[PDB]
């Protein structure tokens with residue numbers, strides 16, 4: 001069946017759309033080639049519609065059926081809880097899209113009578129009606145990139161009331177079921193340090209390792225109605241409250257398998273028969289589907305001792321080599337099996353024999369040295385997108401600060417320490433905003449974090465070595481330096497100079513600012529300050545940070561104030 005059908009109505013914006021990076025003094029201090037930075041808009045939506053619309057042909061076999069039964073036997077151990085309305089309301093981001101029914105995210109979070117009444121009505125409707133397709137809005141996503149232009153990605157999501165109900169029925173399922181089913185292969189249970197440890201230990205565990213990343217083209221569009229019903233068959237193995245069982249059944253038939261598309265103007269846009277990108281099950285469902293197809297494809301390909309690491313549609317496989325020619329042929333057999341399963345490749349996978357050459361979750365393993373000269377493995381990535389987005393976020397107030405998420409997740413990297421920390425601490429200190437909480441995203445969930453709490457966050461995630469790495473690889477240094485020339489970012493010497501300045505100012509303030517000066521900027525001086533465990537680090541409640549993926553799932557993970 002076609003992933004989408006269209007009526008001809010356009011994918012419309014709801015307000016004015018900015019596509020060019022503004023010429024602003026603060027962003028220009030970071031990145032001077034402003035014309036290279038752009039944001040996607042609804043103006044390119046028709047190009048994306050063409051790419052995501054195609055017929056799916058899916059052929060299932062015994063390997064697929066065998067793996068599915070194995071997955072369901074593991075799902076059968078799970079007991080999932082129905083969330084109360086209050087619990088589901090607290091998981092709603094403060095800036096989540098308002099309902100079309102007269103209330104918004106602040107009303108949901110405040111448990112306003114109108115919001116609660118409407119959520120109760122939507123819940124009862126899911127329990128009573130098993131078939132009426134649920135309306136969804138389709139919008140073009142506004143995302144920033146560096147040239148060499150991508151068309152806008154499309155986001156499809158139901159109304160706020162339905163999103164609260166999805167949490168009630170499925171938040172516990174999507175949070176706990178993936179690790180129960182996939183075990184160590186489930187990527188979202190790992191912090192970046194745990195992920196690098198898992199990749200390095202897996203790589204070194206093979207007698208002669210071979211690894212590859214597998215890029216499915218337009219994954220959400222490749223997801224069939226059969227895949228979404230198979231995903232529900234796994235959720236149904238949980239012990240569930242009867243209302244949760246009916247809600248999951250109704251949500252599957254009325255929303256997850258497909259439904260009508262409406263634009264921002266209220267016009268009928270078309271019909272979807274594939275994965276919606278903006279529902280609570282997007283991450284979990286994609287992860288399960290990708291794991292199932294890949295596990296079965298490994299068996300069809302006769303790949304030896306496969307270890308998968310899956311995050312949604314992002315897949316990396318590490319296995320035992322059977323020799324270069326045999327590996328090349330088995331990888332072609334894997335691709336053929338994935339294609340039969342309706343997961344054809346974007347670019348053909350390539351066998352890799354060096355762990356540092358593999359890109360998974362847009363990241364690669366690299367090596368640096370700690371204060372003792374000991375080798376420390378860590379995850380890095382090409383810094384082009386992070387820098388382009390940091391420049392955008394400097395010129396415009398954006399709802400999500402990718403720069404803050406990048407400092408947290410890529411804290412050990414040369415580029416996050418020398419450029420992102422220096423730039424934003426310099427600006428925030430000048431604005432007396434170091435203690436102002438900002439929103440960022442970790443594995444798709446929204447968190448409100450104060451920049452002054454970064455040292456203890458980084459220590460907990462990455463260890464104290466994140467503040468002592470030096471002797472970065474020549475390849476990594478070259479990639480960063482080349483990116484700076486390309487984007488017109490000042491060279492690393494300028495960053496060191498700016499860091500010494502903000503470091504002095506932070507130290508002069510005492511308190512949490514001085515802890516930022518000491519730990520975050522010790523790299524900038526020859527006269528190193530002594531770095532001991534931060535007392536606040538052991539007290540941090542990082543429950544919920546690295547449990548599951550929630551991208552597109554409308555999840556907020558910071559504390560709700562009492563009432």
Ligand SMILES: Cc1cc2c(-c3ccc[nH]c3=O)c(C(=O)NS(=O)(=O)C3CC3)n(Cc3cc(F)ccc3F)c2cc1F
Pocket residue numbers: 192195311312314360361362363379405406409410441442443444549550551
């Ligand atoms: C080192 C490291 C950092 C991240 C971050 C991450 C970086 C910066 C800020 N905040 C973050 O969370 C994410 C991530 O953005 N997750 S997500 O669910 O929104 C997914 C995009 C939909 N991931 C998983 C992931 C990354 C892809 F680039 C692609 C697919 C994926 F699953 C990571 C894996 C890692 F090894």
